[PDB]
Design an enzyme around this catalytic site. Sequence first.
Site, mmCIF file in Angstrom:
data_model
loop_
_atom_site.group_PDB
_atom_site.id
_atom_site.type_symbol
_atom_site.label_atom_id
_atom_site.label_comp_id
_atom_site.label_asym_id
_atom_site.label_seq_id
_atom_site.Cartn_x
_atom_site.Cartn_y
_atom_site.Cartn_z
ATOM 1 N N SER A 176 71.706 -37.888 41.048
ATOM 2 C CA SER A 176 72.701 -36.783 41.469
ATOM 3 C C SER A 176 73.892 -37.230 42.280
ATOM 4 O O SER A 176 74.668 -36.340 42.510
ATOM 5 C CB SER A 176 72.080 -35.859 42.026
ATOM 6 O OG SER A 176 71.278 -34.983 41.214
ATOM 7 N N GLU A 214 72.959 -34.772 32.185
ATOM 8 C CA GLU A 214 71.652 -34.262 32.816
ATOM 9 C C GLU A 214 70.812 -33.719 31.761
ATOM 10 O O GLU A 214 71.305 -33.358 30.732
ATOM 11 C CB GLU A 214 72.041 -32.872 33.717
ATOM 12 C CG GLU A 214 72.863 -33.586 35.158
ATOM 13 C CD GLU A 214 71.874 -34.432 35.839
ATOM 14 O OE1 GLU A 214 70.790 -34.500 35.962
ATOM 15 O OE2 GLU A 214 72.350 -34.869 36.953
#
Length: 268
Positions: free
Chosen positions: A44, A141
């Site tokens: 992330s 993602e």
Amino acid sequence: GARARKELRTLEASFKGRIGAYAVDTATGKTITYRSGERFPLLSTFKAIAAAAVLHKARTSDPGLLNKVVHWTTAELQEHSPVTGKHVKDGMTVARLCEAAITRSDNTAANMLLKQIGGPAGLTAYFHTLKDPVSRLDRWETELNNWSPKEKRDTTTPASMGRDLRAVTTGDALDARDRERLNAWLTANKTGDARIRAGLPKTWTVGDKTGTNSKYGAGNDIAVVWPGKSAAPIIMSIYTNRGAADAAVDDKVIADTAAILARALGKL
């Protein structure tokens, strides 16, 4: 950085893993580096730079982008979508999606941000505008998190990401208004209490973005840090993993690395 490299080598031995670390003093240009050119997954941590790319686009070519409302279906929701999961019916502005992607690491929000800048390829193009030809986002993602030692997709190096974060939080990659907005999101981050923030004095201002993946205990934290009420900032970029697929993420190693870096730069 000789003392720091010995301390990091010893810390690395203590958890039988791998530490990649980069720190730079933005006033002196002095750096501390340990495996700083080795390859680690972004995880992330890319979300900080995705928000920068969105701010840059809104400022220079797409007025109103930050106020644009984005919607998603329930079927588009990714694992760990604590904010976007609550706004399926009403959507969210691009600005709020930046806040969610940074401060809660919201995965659907991050995919929504990628949709504003040309996807993973477009984020990679933005890396190039920061003079970073190394970091590359290949997947959305959450597939981008699937890293193992041989994986080359969705990777960076501590130094590459450190230079990128320096450019957008303290350099001239962004307008001063956008730089301040990005830093306000980073300092409001909710996910990094056991990493860089834990290793540094509580009175310091720390704006950070974490990354975590259970496999190989991959744990990252990158930050802009103001070491005092009134001090030139330093940038830290810490990427770690373990030597076993089933090993644990080691937050304490990241916090100890941060303290080592701050001491080596003479700020602690």
